[PDB]
Amino acid sequence: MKVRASVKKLCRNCKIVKRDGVIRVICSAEPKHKQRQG
Template identity: 70%
Template structure:
């Protein structure tokens, strides 16, 4: 699933979707901003809060 709109979602082979944004921010207290392989990501218990900068 890919939508070519600002803040589109990206679906990996595992079927997990993630928001792709120019600016990633914490959405709740449980969100964590991490850096993996030069990419800034937000991970959270709430799947709707998952983001990747790009």
């Protein structure tokens, strides 16, 4: 992970979810895609 800003879809299994006030990437193709902010 990199913390970043602005969220994009890295793979077809990034679900992309708004958890509290921060958009989280949770993925089920690779754990690699888990960007903390969008």
